[PDB]
DNA sequence: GGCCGCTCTAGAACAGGATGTATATATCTGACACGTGCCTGGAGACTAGGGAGTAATCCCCTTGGCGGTTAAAACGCGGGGGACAGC
């Protein structure tokens, strides 16, 4: 199962990173406290990085548009700007 | 020095998650039927001896009749006891 990701896990990850930024430090605790259902740590890591890159791409698409929700694996429960800002702000 | 734009706050709408309940769908459970394979019993064939069947004769038993006598059965009558209904 560890290579799959469920929409409930997409939700839980999205909320987690909305609260905590680069979860991959904490992420073991976030599984151990049950915030995230059990999955491969590597899979959560890569799908996090993937959506960070997709958020950057969304910002490039905004730049293309002028010169906000976007899906993960079709799951619409995601937006770029909140995550990107929250992650960098909480890191700082 | 003035006005408009930008930012923040407030209200409204929509969606998702959480929880409980109902309904539909799937799975199990069981028995019957059919198919397959193997083994055993039945079927077929042949012979010899014994049992059954057939025939005759004789003897004993059973059936039928007669007569008389005796006991049993049938008819009769009255009274008592038991059975039946009630409470």
mmCIF file with all atom_site columns, C-alpha atoms (C1' of nucleotides) in Angstrom:
data_model
loop_
_atom_site.group_PDB
_atom_site.id
_atom_site.type_symbol
_atom_site.label_atom_id
_atom_site.label_alt_id
_atom_site.label_comp_id
_atom_site.label_asym_id
_atom_site.label_entity_id
_atom_site.label_seq_id
_atom_site.pdbx_PDB_ins_code
_atom_site.Cartn_x
_atom_site.Cartn_y
_atom_site.Cartn_z
_atom_site.occupancy
_atom_site.B_iso_or_equiv
_atom_site.pdbx_formal_charge
_atom_site.auth_seq_id
_atom_site.auth_comp_id
_atom_site.auth_asym_id
_atom_site.auth_atom_id
_atom_site.pdbx_PDB_model_num
ATOM 1   C CA    . UNK A 1 1  ? 0.000   0.000    0.000   1.00 0.00 ? 1  UNK A CA    1
ATOM 2   C CA    . UNK A 1 2  ? 2.925   2.268    0.793   1.00 0.00 ? 2  UNK A CA    1
ATOM 3   C CA    . UNK A 1 3  ? 3.269   3.496    -2.803  1.00 0.00 ? 3  UNK A CA    1
ATOM 4   C CA    . UNK A 1 4  ? -0.394  4.506    -2.966  1.00 0.00 ? 4  UNK A CA    1
ATOM 5   C CA    . UNK A 1 5  ? -1.678  7.769    -1.521  1.00 0.00 ? 5  UNK A CA    1
ATOM 6   C CA    . UNK A 1 6  ? -5.290  8.251    -0.467  1.00 0.00 ? 6  UNK A CA    1
ATOM 7   C CA    . UNK A 1 7  ? -7.330  11.425   -0.805  1.00 0.00 ? 7  UNK A CA    1
ATOM 8   C CA    . UNK A 1 8  ? -7.672  11.465   2.985   1.00 0.00 ? 8  UNK A CA    1
ATOM 9   C CA    . UNK A 1 9  ? -3.873  11.350   3.138   1.00 0.00 ? 9  UNK A CA    1
ATOM 10  C CA    . UNK A 1 10 ? -3.665  14.153   0.561   1.00 0.00 ? 10 UNK A CA    1
ATOM 11  C CA    . UNK A 1 11 ? -5.995  16.150   2.832   1.00 0.00 ? 11 UNK A CA    1
ATOM 12  C CA    . UNK A 1 12 ? -3.996  15.342   5.968   1.00 0.00 ? 12 UNK A CA    1
ATOM 13  C CA    . UNK A 1 13 ? -0.683  16.218   4.298   1.00 0.00 ? 13 UNK A CA    1
ATOM 14  C CA    . UNK A 1 14 ? -2.091  19.467   2.903   1.00 0.00 ? 14 UNK A CA    1
ATOM 15  C CA    . UNK A 1 15 ? -3.340  20.502   6.355   1.00 0.00 ? 15 UNK A CA    1
ATOM 16  C CA    . UNK A 1 16 ? -0.081  19.372   7.975   1.00 0.00 ? 16 UNK A CA    1
ATOM 17  C CA    . UNK A 1 17 ? 2.105   21.440   5.649   1.00 0.00 ? 17 UNK A CA    1
ATOM 18  C CA    . UNK A 1 18 ? -0.340  24.339   6.027   1.00 0.00 ? 18 UNK A CA    1
ATOM 19  C CA    . UNK A 1 19 ? 0.459   24.212   9.747   1.00 0.00 ? 19 UNK A CA    1
ATOM 20  C CA    . UNK A 1 20 ? 4.090   23.064   9.878   1.00 0.00 ? 20 UNK A CA    1
ATOM 21  C CA    . UNK A 1 21 ? 5.839   23.763   6.568   1.00 0.00 ? 21 UNK A CA    1
ATOM 22  C CA    . UNK A 1 22 ? 8.529   21.273   5.529   1.00 0.00 ? 22 UNK A CA    1
ATOM 23  C CA    . UNK A 1 23 ? 6.994   18.346   7.384   1.00 0.00 ? 23 UNK A CA    1
ATOM 24  C CA    . UNK A 1 24 ? 9.780   15.944   6.366   1.00 0.00 ? 24 UNK A CA    1
ATOM 25  C CA    . UNK A 1 25 ? 11.634  16.870   9.559   1.00 0.00 ? 25 UNK A CA    1
ATOM 26  C CA    . UNK A 1 26 ? 8.623   16.133   11.775  1.00 0.00 ? 26 UNK A CA    1
ATOM 27  C CA    . UNK A 1 27 ? 7.004   13.683   9.382   1.00 0.00 ? 27 UNK A CA    1
ATOM 28  C CA    . UNK A 1 28 ? 7.905   10.588   11.406  1.00 0.00 ? 28 UNK A CA    1
ATOM 29  C CA    . UNK A 1 29 ? 6.109   12.123   14.395  1.00 0.00 ? 29 UNK A CA    1
ATOM 30  C CA    . UNK A 1 30 ? 3.166   13.087   12.164  1.00 0.00 ? 30 UNK A CA    1
ATOM 31  C CA    . UNK A 1 31 ? 2.751   9.431    11.233  1.00 0.00 ? 31 UNK A CA    1
ATOM 32  C CA    . UNK A 1 32 ? 3.419   8.267    14.795  1.00 0.00 ? 32 UNK A CA    1
ATOM 33  C CA    . UNK A 1 33 ? 0.755   10.595   16.215  1.00 0.00 ? 33 UNK A CA    1
ATOM 34  C CA    . UNK A 1 34 ? -1.663  9.411    13.506  1.00 0.00 ? 34 UNK A CA    1
ATOM 35  C CA    . UNK A 1 35 ? -2.037  12.792   11.797  1.00 0.00 ? 35 UNK A CA    1
ATOM 36  C CA    . UNK A 1 36 ? -1.027  11.000   8.590   1.00 0.00 ? 36 UNK A CA    1
ATOM 37  C CA    . UNK A 1 37 ? -2.053  7.409    7.873   1.00 0.00 ? 37 UNK A CA    1
ATOM 38  C CA    . UNK A 1 38 ? 0.945   5.104    7.563   1.00 0.00 ? 38 UNK A CA    1
ATOM 39  C CA    . UNK A 1 39 ? 2.681   5.351    4.188   1.00 0.00 ? 39 UNK A CA    1
ATOM 40  C CA    . UNK A 1 40 ? 6.223   5.369    2.875   1.00 0.00 ? 40 UNK A CA    1
ATOM 41  C CA    . UNK A 1 41 ? 8.144   8.324    4.283   1.00 0.00 ? 41 UNK A CA    1
ATOM 42  C CA    . UNK A 1 42 ? 9.825   8.595    0.878   1.00 0.00 ? 42 UNK A CA    1
ATOM 43  C CA    . UNK A 1 43 ? 6.451   8.767    -0.886  1.00 0.00 ? 43 UNK A CA    1
ATOM 44  C CA    . UNK A 1 44 ? 5.232   11.590   1.364   1.00 0.00 ? 44 UNK A CA    1
ATOM 45  C CA    . UNK A 1 45 ? 8.587   13.312   0.850   1.00 0.00 ? 45 UNK A CA    1
ATOM 46  C CA    . UNK A 1 46 ? 8.560   13.103   -2.932  1.00 0.00 ? 46 UNK A CA    1
ATOM 47  C CA    . UNK A 1 47 ? 4.892   14.088   -3.238  1.00 0.00 ? 47 UNK A CA    1
ATOM 48  C CA    . UNK A 1 48 ? 5.603   17.069   -0.983  1.00 0.00 ? 48 UNK A CA    1
ATOM 49  C CA    . UNK A 1 49 ? 8.547   18.155   -3.127  1.00 0.00 ? 49 UNK A CA    1
ATOM 50  C CA    . UNK A 1 50 ? 6.443   17.501   -6.244  1.00 0.00 ? 50 UNK A CA    1
ATOM 51  C CA    . UNK A 1 51 ? 3.712   19.853   -5.053  1.00 0.00 ? 51 UNK A CA    1
ATOM 52  C CA    . UNK A 1 52 ? 6.312   22.449   -4.036  1.00 0.00 ? 52 UNK A CA    1
ATOM 53  C CA    . UNK A 1 53 ? 7.532   22.372   -7.636  1.00 0.00 ? 53 UNK A CA    1
ATOM 54  C CA    . UNK A 1 54 ? 3.938   22.476   -8.895  1.00 0.00 ? 54 UNK A CA    1
ATOM 55  C CA    . UNK A 1 55 ? 3.325   25.541   -6.707  1.00 0.00 ? 55 UNK A CA    1
ATOM 56  C CA    . UNK A 1 56 ? 6.394   27.206   -8.216  1.00 0.00 ? 56 UNK A CA    1
ATOM 57  C CA    . UNK A 1 57 ? 5.048   26.316   -11.662 1.00 0.00 ? 57 UNK A CA    1
ATOM 58  C CA    . UNK A 1 58 ? 1.694   27.846   -10.687 1.00 0.00 ? 58 UNK A CA    1
ATOM 59  C CA    . UNK A 1 59 ? 3.551   31.059   -9.804  1.00 0.00 ? 59 UNK A CA    1
ATOM 60  C CA    . UNK A 1 60 ? 5.229   30.919   -13.214 1.00 0.00 ? 60 UNK A CA    1
ATOM 61  C CA    . UNK A 1 61 ? 1.810   30.460   -14.828 1.00 0.00 ? 61 UNK A CA    1
ATOM 62  C CA    . UNK A 1 62 ? 0.605   33.521   -12.909 1.00 0.00 ? 62 UNK A CA    1
ATOM 63  C CA    . UNK A 1 63 ? 3.596   35.424   -14.304 1.00 0.00 ? 63 UNK A CA    1
ATOM 64  C CA    . UNK A 1 64 ? 2.756   34.213   -17.817 1.00 0.00 ? 64 UNK A CA    1
ATOM 65  C CA    . UNK A 1 65 ? -0.871  35.252   -17.279 1.00 0.00 ? 65 UNK A CA    1
ATOM 66  C CA    . UNK A 1 66 ? -0.180  38.798   -16.118 1.00 0.00 ? 66 UNK A CA    1
ATOM 67  C CA    . UNK A 1 67 ? 2.843   39.469   -18.346 1.00 0.00 ? 67 UNK A CA    1
ATOM 68  C CA    . UNK A 1 68 ? -5.462  29.587   -5.982  1.00 0.00 ? 68 UNK A CA    1
ATOM 69  C CA    . UNK A 1 69 ? -6.504  25.959   -6.291  1.00 0.00 ? 69 UNK A CA    1
ATOM 70  C CA    . UNK A 1 70 ? -4.607  23.361   -8.264  1.00 0.00 ? 70 UNK A CA    1
ATOM 71  C CA    . UNK A 1 71 ? -4.971  19.608   -8.005  1.00 0.00 ? 71 UNK A CA    1
ATOM 72  C CA    . UNK A 1 72 ? -2.723  16.820   -6.800  1.00 0.00 ? 72 UNK A CA    1
ATOM 73  C CA    . UNK A 1 73 ? -3.448  13.519   -8.560  1.00 0.00 ? 73 UNK A CA    1
ATOM 74  C CA    . UNK A 1 74 ? -6.757  15.104   -9.525  1.00 0.00 ? 74 UNK A CA    1
ATOM 75  C CA    . UNK A 1 75 ? -7.550  15.866   -5.879  1.00 0.00 ? 75 UNK A CA    1
ATOM 76  C CA    . UNK A 1 76 ? -8.543  19.542   -6.037  1.00 0.00 ? 76 UNK A CA    1
ATOM 77  C CA    . UNK A 1 77 ? -7.802  20.046   -2.309  1.00 0.00 ? 77 UNK A CA    1
ATOM 78  C CA    . UNK A 1 78 ? -4.636  22.050   -2.904  1.00 0.00 ? 78 UNK A CA    1
ATOM 79  C CA    . UNK A 1 79 ? -3.445  25.592   -3.604  1.00 0.00 ? 79 UNK A CA    1
ATOM 80  C CA    . UNK A 1 80 ? 0.034   26.924   -4.341  1.00 0.00 ? 80 UNK A CA    1
ATOM 81  C CA    . UNK A 1 81 ? 0.422   30.322   -2.709  1.00 0.00 ? 81 UNK A CA    1
ATOM 82  C CA    . UNK A 1 82 ? -0.728  29.464   0.809   1.00 0.00 ? 82 UNK A CA    1
ATOM 83  C CA    . UNK A 1 83 ? 1.642   26.499   0.968   1.00 0.00 ? 83 UNK A CA    1
ATOM 84  C CA    . UNK A 1 84 ? 4.633   28.300   -0.526  1.00 0.00 ? 84 UNK A CA    1
ATOM 85  C CA    . UNK A 1 85 ? 4.318   31.366   1.699   1.00 0.00 ? 85 UNK A CA    1
ATOM 86  C CA    . UNK A 1 86 ? 3.471   29.379   4.829   1.00 0.00 ? 86 UNK A CA    1
ATOM 87  C CA    . UNK A 1 87 ? 6.430   27.032   4.307   1.00 0.00 ? 87 UNK A CA    1
ATOM 88  C CA    . UNK A 1 88 ? 8.963   29.813   3.799   1.00 0.00 ? 88 UNK A CA    1
ATOM 89  C CA    . UNK A 1 89 ? 7.512   31.984   6.576   1.00 0.00 ? 89 UNK A CA    1
ATOM 90  C CA    . UNK A 1 90 ? 7.513   29.153   9.121   1.00 0.00 ? 90 UNK A CA    1
ATOM 91  C CA    . UNK A 1 91 ? 11.048  28.185   8.112   1.00 0.00 ? 91 UNK A CA    1
ATOM 92  C CA    . UNK A 1 92 ? 12.210  31.775   8.645   1.00 0.00 ? 92 UNK A CA    1
ATOM 93  C "C1'" . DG  B 2 1  ? -4.307  69.802   0.636   1.00 0.00 ? 1  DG  B "C1'" 1
ATOM 94  C "C1'" . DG  B 2 2  ? -7.791  66.551   -1.304  1.00 0.00 ? 2  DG  B "C1'" 1
ATOM 95  C "C1'" . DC  B 2 3  ? -9.532  62.302   -3.253  1.00 0.00 ? 3  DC  B "C1'" 1
ATOM 96  C "C1'" . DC  B 2 4  ? -9.286  57.692   -4.623  1.00 0.00 ? 4  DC  B "C1'" 1
ATOM 97  C "C1'" . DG  B 2 5  ? -7.286  53.240   -4.090  1.00 0.00 ? 5  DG  B "C1'" 1
ATOM 98  C "C1'" . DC  B 2 6  ? -5.886  49.644   -1.216  1.00 0.00 ? 6  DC  B "C1'" 1
ATOM 99  C "C1'" . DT  B 2 7  ? -6.308  46.903   2.854   1.00 0.00 ? 7  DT  B "C1'" 1
ATOM 100 C "C1'" . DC  B 2 8  ? -8.778  44.915   6.451   1.00 0.00 ? 8  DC  B "C1'" 1
ATOM 101 C "C1'" . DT  B 2 9  ? -12.950 43.377   8.520   1.00 0.00 ? 9  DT  B "C1'" 1
ATOM 102 C "C1'" . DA  B 2 10 ? -17.562 41.415   8.286   1.00 0.00 ? 10 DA  B "C1'" 1
ATOM 103 C "C1'" . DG  B 2 11 ? -21.125 38.657   6.258   1.00 0.00 ? 11 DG  B "C1'" 1
ATOM 104 C "C1'" . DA  B 2 12 ? -22.624 35.121   3.322   1.00 0.00 ? 12 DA  B "C1'" 1
ATOM 105 C "C1'" . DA  B 2 13 ? -22.137 30.867   0.681   1.00 0.00 ? 13 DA  B "C1'" 1
ATOM 106 C "C1'" . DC  B 2 14 ? -20.400 26.439   -0.290  1.00 0.00 ? 14 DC  B "C1'" 1
ATOM 107 C "C1'" . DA  B 2 15 ? -17.927 22.225   0.546   1.00 0.00 ? 15 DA  B "C1'" 1
ATOM 108 C "C1'" . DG  B 2 16 ? -15.928 18.662   3.221   1.00 0.00 ? 16 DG  B "C1'" 1
ATOM 109 C "C1'" . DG  B 2 17 ? -15.541 15.837   7.082   1.00 0.00 ? 17 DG  B "C1'" 1
ATOM 110 C "C1'" . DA  B 2 18 ? -17.691 13.289   10.644  1.00 0.00 ? 18 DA  B "C1'" 1
ATOM 111 C "C1'" . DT  B 2 19 ? -21.241 9.985    12.238  1.00 0.00 ? 19 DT  B "C1'" 1
ATOM 112 C "C1'" . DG  B 2 20 ? -25.069 6.949    11.960  1.00 0.00 ? 20 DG  B "C1'" 1
ATOM 113 C "C1'" . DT  B 2 21 ? -28.330 4.213    9.385   1.00 0.00 ? 21 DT  B "C1'" 1
ATOM 114 C "C1'" . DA  B 2 22 ? -30.322 1.651    5.628   1.00 0.00 ? 22 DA  B "C1'" 1
ATOM 115 C "C1'" . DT  B 2 23 ? -30.117 -0.918   1.424   1.00 0.00 ? 23 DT  B "C1'" 1
ATOM 116 C "C1'" . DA  B 2 24 ? -28.183 -3.572   -2.034  1.00 0.00 ? 24 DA  B "C1'" 1
ATOM 117 C "C1'" . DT  B 2 25 ? -24.949 -6.931   -3.318  1.00 0.00 ? 25 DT  B "C1'" 1
ATOM 118 C "C1'" . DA  B 2 26 ? -21.971 -10.695  -2.652  1.00 0.00 ? 26 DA  B "C1'" 1
ATOM 119 C "C1'" . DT  B 2 27 ? -20.668 -14.951  -0.461  1.00 0.00 ? 27 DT  B "C1'" 1
ATOM 120 C "C1'" . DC  B 2 28 ? -21.404 -18.932  1.880   1.00 0.00 ? 28 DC  B "C1'" 1
ATOM 121 C "C1'" . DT  B 2 29 ? -23.790 -23.075  2.738   1.00 0.00 ? 29 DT  B "C1'" 1
ATOM 122 C "C1'" . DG  B 2 30 ? -25.849 -27.348  1.250   1.00 0.00 ? 30 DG  B "C1'" 1
ATOM 123 C "C1'" . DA  B 2 31 ? -27.675 -30.708  -1.563  1.00 0.00 ? 31 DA  B "C1'" 1
ATOM 124 C "C1'" . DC  B 2 32 ? -28.433 -32.822  -5.828  1.00 0.00 ? 32 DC  B "C1'" 1
ATOM 125 C "C1'" . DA  B 2 33 ? -27.009 -34.439  -10.244 1.00 0.00 ? 33 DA  B "C1'" 1
ATOM 126 C "C1'" . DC  B 2 34 ? -23.822 -35.982  -13.450 1.00 0.00 ? 34 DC  B "C1'" 1
ATOM 127 C "C1'" . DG  B 2 35 ? -19.521 -37.963  -14.879 1.00 0.00 ? 35 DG  B "C1'" 1
ATOM 128 C "C1'" . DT  B 2 36 ? -15.685 -41.162  -14.342 1.00 0.00 ? 36 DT  B "C1'" 1
ATOM 129 C "C1'" . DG  B 2 37 ? -13.219 -45.238  -13.012 1.00 0.00 ? 37 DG  B "C1'" 1
ATOM 130 C "C1'" . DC  B 2 38 ? -12.737 -49.497  -10.933 1.00 0.00 ? 38 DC  B "C1'" 1
ATOM 131 C "C1'" . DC  B 2 39 ? -14.114 -53.675  -9.031  1.00 0.00 ? 39 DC  B "C1'" 1
ATOM 132 C "C1'" . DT  B 2 40 ? -17.340 -57.157  -8.239  1.00 0.00 ? 40 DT  B "C1'" 1
ATOM 133 C "C1'" . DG  B 2 41 ? -21.191 -59.672  -9.235  1.00 0.00 ? 41 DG  B "C1'" 1
ATOM 134 C "C1'" . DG  B 2 42 ? -24.191 -61.261  -12.479 1.00 0.00 ? 42 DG  B "C1'" 1
ATOM 135 C "C1'" . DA  B 2 43 ? -24.900 -63.462  -16.706 1.00 0.00 ? 43 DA  B "C1'" 1
ATOM 136 C "C1'" . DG  B 2 44 ? -23.914 -67.198  -19.773 1.00 0.00 ? 44 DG  B "C1'" 1
ATOM 137 C "C1'" . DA  B 2 45 ? -22.607 -71.985  -20.558 1.00 0.00 ? 45 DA  B "C1'" 1
ATOM 138 C "C1'" . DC  B 2 46 ? -22.372 -76.957  -19.342 1.00 0.00 ? 46 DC  B "C1'" 1
ATOM 139 C "C1'" . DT  B 2 47 ? -22.961 -81.314  -16.458 1.00 0.00 ? 47 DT  B "C1'" 1
ATOM 140 C "C1'" . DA  B 2 48 ? -24.570 -84.534  -12.807 1.00 0.00 ? 48 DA  B "C1'" 1
ATOM 141 C "C1'" . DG  B 2 49 ? -27.250 -85.941  -9.240  1.00 0.00 ? 49 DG  B "C1'" 1
ATOM 142 C "C1'" . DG  B 2 50 ? -31.100 -85.459  -6.386  1.00 0.00 ? 50 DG  B "C1'" 1
ATOM 143 C "C1'" . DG  B 2 51 ? -35.706 -84.082  -5.591  1.00 0.00 ? 51 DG  B "C1'" 1
ATOM 144 C "C1'" . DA  B 2 52 ? -39.961 -83.611  -7.016  1.00 0.00 ? 52 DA  B "C1'" 1
ATOM 145 C "C1'" . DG  B 2 53 ? -43.674 -85.326  -9.472  1.00 0.00 ? 53 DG  B "C1'" 1
ATOM 146 C "C1'" . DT  B 2 54 ? -46.514 -89.071  -10.984 1.00 0.00 ? 54 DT  B "C1'" 1
ATOM 147 C "C1'" . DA  B 2 55 ? -49.111 -93.427  -10.363 1.00 0.00 ? 55 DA  B "C1'" 1
ATOM 148 C "C1'" . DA  B 2 56 ? -51.127 -97.176  -7.807  1.00 0.00 ? 56 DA  B "C1'" 1
ATOM 149 C "C1'" . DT  B 2 57 ? -52.899 -99.514  -3.801  1.00 0.00 ? 57 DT  B "C1'" 1
ATOM 150 C "C1'" . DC  B 2 58 ? -54.329 -100.138 0.818   1.00 0.00 ? 58 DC  B "C1'" 1
ATOM 151 C "C1'" . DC  B 2 59 ? -55.751 -98.790  5.282   1.00 0.00 ? 59 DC  B "C1'" 1
ATOM 152 C "C1'" . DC  B 2 60 ? -57.506 -95.838  8.519   1.00 0.00 ? 60 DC  B "C1'" 1
ATOM 153 C "C1'" . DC  B 2 61 ? -60.115 -92.099  9.706   1.00 0.00 ? 61 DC  B "C1'" 1
ATOM 154 C "C1'" . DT  B 2 62 ? -64.027 -89.088  9.225   1.00 0.00 ? 62 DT  B "C1'" 1
ATOM 155 C "C1'" . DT  B 2 63 ? -68.559 -88.308  8.291   1.00 0.00 ? 63 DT  B "C1'" 1
ATOM 156 C "C1'" . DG  B 2 64 ? -73.335 -89.518  8.755   1.00 0.00 ? 64 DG  B "C1'" 1
ATOM 157 C "C1'" . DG  B 2 65 ? -77.323 -91.986  10.951  1.00 0.00 ? 65 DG  B "C1'" 1
ATOM 158 C "C1'" . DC  B 2 66 ? -79.993 -93.919  14.885  1.00 0.00 ? 66 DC  B "C1'" 1
ATOM 159 C "C1'" . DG  B 2 67 ? -81.772 -94.104  19.719  1.00 0.00 ? 67 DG  B "C1'" 1
ATOM 160 C "C1'" . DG  B 2 68 ? -82.068 -93.097  24.425  1.00 0.00 ? 68 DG  B "C1'" 1
ATOM 161 C "C1'" . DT  B 2 69 ? -81.071 -90.675  28.460  1.00 0.00 ? 69 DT  B "C1'" 1
ATOM 162 C "C1'" . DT  B 2 70 ? -79.621 -86.966  31.155  1.00 0.00 ? 70 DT  B "C1'" 1
ATOM 163 C "C1'" . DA  B 2 71 ? -78.197 -82.539  32.046  1.00 0.00 ? 71 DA  B "C1'" 1
ATOM 164 C "C1'" . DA  B 2 72 ? -78.221 -78.116  30.618  1.00 0.00 ? 72 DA  B "C1'" 1
ATOM 165 C "C1'" . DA  B 2 73 ? -80.538 -74.202  28.815  1.00 0.00 ? 73 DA  B "C1'" 1
ATOM 166 C "C1'" . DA  B 2 74 ? -84.415 -71.400  28.576  1.00 0.00 ? 74 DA  B "C1'" 1
ATOM 167 C "C1'" . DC  B 2 75 ? -88.313 -69.195  30.464  1.00 0.00 ? 75 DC  B "C1'" 1
ATOM 168 C "C1'" . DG  B 2 76 ? -90.203 -66.937  34.399  1.00 0.00 ? 76 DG  B "C1'" 1
ATOM 169 C "C1'" . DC  B 2 77 ? -90.643 -63.855  38.602  1.00 0.00 ? 77 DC  B "C1'" 1
ATOM 170 C "C1'" . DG  B 2 78 ? -89.384 -60.847  42.528  1.00 0.00 ? 78 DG  B "C1'" 1
ATOM 171 C "C1'" . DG  B 2 79 ? -86.442 -58.340  45.288  1.00 0.00 ? 79 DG  B "C1'" 1
ATOM 172 C "C1'" . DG  B 2 80 ? -82.273 -56.217  46.340  1.00 0.00 ? 80 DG  B "C1'" 1
ATOM 173 C "C1'" . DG  B 2 81 ? -78.157 -53.929  45.263  1.00 0.00 ? 81 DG  B "C1'" 1
ATOM 174 C "C1'" . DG  B 2 82 ? -75.556 -51.308  42.363  1.00 0.00 ? 82 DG  B "C1'" 1
ATOM 175 C "C1'" . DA  B 2 83 ? -75.235 -47.790  39.082  1.00 0.00 ? 83 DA  B "C1'" 1
ATOM 176 C "C1'" . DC  B 2 84 ? -76.183 -43.327  37.683  1.00 0.00 ? 84 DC  B "C1'" 1
ATOM 177 C "C1'" . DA  B 2 85 ? -77.166 -38.096  38.397  1.00 0.00 ? 85 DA  B "C1'" 1
ATOM 178 C "C1'" . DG  B 2 86 ? -76.751 -34.624  41.133  1.00 0.00 ? 86 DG  B "C1'" 1
ATOM 179 C "C1'" . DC  B 2 87 ? -74.512 -31.358  44.427  1.00 0.00 ? 87 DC  B "C1'" 1
#
